[PDB]
Symmetry: D2
């Protein structure tokens, strides 16, 4: 592993992803060149340090996902759920009732009737909130389906 | 311990507290009559059940604080930090920078220069947010002080 | 959906799994008959209640995995990581150094040189501990390989 | 603020405390000279770095407590609960039943009848485990009392 600050390109990929949902509140990222490019949210100090000193991933901050080239030969940032804690959430989310929220955390899809609020602006992937506004996972909207309207991806 | 649904009075005390900060998103509470009255956020089903069946505190839901009579012989709800996860936060909070946020979680007060945003409407106790908008504790505003502008109460 | 206490057979499937690793410390389980049989660790009181009163999964306790029929037409309990918190761990585990432990939590396999201790007794799946003895995930031992000796399954 | 590796003396104060309970599994600590000396468990890499580069507390690792001079003018390390995650626990602990464990996490003392196991070797402060062997807090043994045999200190 080489560990470095994120490239301008990589930041844009990370930003593109965050901006599907809202405002990216966190500025500083490092990349761990492994098999794939792992993205860490780092504090400003670590971001500064990493210029002069290689640091191991366990000293960096928070792993928030990976950059890979997808099927279409398009580089994408693939966030983990932790990445979403960096976002002031504004859109492409659904709020589920408490029962459905709970079930969602067990890997269950959510039915449409369980959706209390949806603010959807296009994204396939939506942030799934429980009824307390907390992120419980990421879901795949299934615009046509009812029982499985929000397909469980991550929880 | 008798375990019961919260009284209308007790709900009002709980609501009074939540409404210093925003909208109480959670409706159902039980009270565990111990030495003091412990408040649990319970789901609707448990709230319904508790009518017919005593349940032990470990089956109820989330302990969110205690009702006691304060110094002025005034009954107050004393929330724990968990109570605040029930509130759509709107006011009486401060947002700290990441460095100060971190230190706050170690029990440190926050200086005024660390305050990135304050939406204060009167309360002595403010919700302290980190720079990601997450609740890191409760603070006592010290309107006149600088180094200890937000006194650490809970984190 | 039907929620009931776990059958004798289901308890054996659960116990079989726990006993690969150690002593199952938790006695009481319920099953939620959904698409698949989901297993909840419940407290004794809930286990008692669920006799006379249906409860919803969000009132039950802790989701710990699912019973399904595998490829061999053999019923198996598939634990999630939370299940392992119910086990006094004794065997089929590895302990990783801190660097490898951290990386494991990011979905990385662990190399053999990272294994500080292994107490392996046959199981494909091993509990992966960090250097503090805390469960960080489950891994697939690849006895013959070096770079990917512990294949990451869950973390 | 000055951030440095822990002194030999400070390491002894930390080790003294850990060794009341078992084996300190973590070797590397830094100290943040604030109002008091705050102790951070840091990884080896950070411990190495902190030689040549000041880092802020938010980059260090895990805050585990504070060194202060007590009433007897004796320097002591005061751990927080997180410190105990660094210890292979061997002694000065009690194990509580699940009901009492839960109540303990709400700040309640534990009665003697709730103690399932006690391995006590002298310490006023005992690690309190739940019935799954997980640390739920620290308690003050009140050898002579029954209702409040384990006084709740931290949970």
């Amino acid at each position: 592993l080489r560990v470095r600050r994120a490239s301008s390109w990589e930041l844009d990929l990370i930003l593109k992803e965050a901006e599907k949902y809202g405002e990216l509140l966190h500025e500083f990222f490092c990349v761990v060149e492994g098999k794939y490019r792992d993205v860490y949210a780092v504090n400003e100090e670590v971001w500064k340090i990493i210029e002069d000193i290689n640091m191991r991933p366990y000293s960096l901050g928070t792993f928030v996902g990976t950059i890979r080239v997808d099927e279409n030969l398009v580089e994408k940032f693939y966030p983990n759920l932790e990445f979403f804690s960096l976002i002031k959430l504004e859109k492409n989310y659904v709020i589920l009732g408490p029962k459905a929220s709970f079930l969602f955390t067990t890997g269950k899809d959510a039915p449409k009737e369980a959706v209390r609020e949806i603010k959807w602006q296009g994204s396939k992937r939506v942030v799934v909130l429980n009824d307390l506004g907390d992120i419980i996972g990421i879901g795949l909207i299934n615009p046509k389906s009812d029982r499985r309207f929000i397909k469980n991806l991550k929880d």
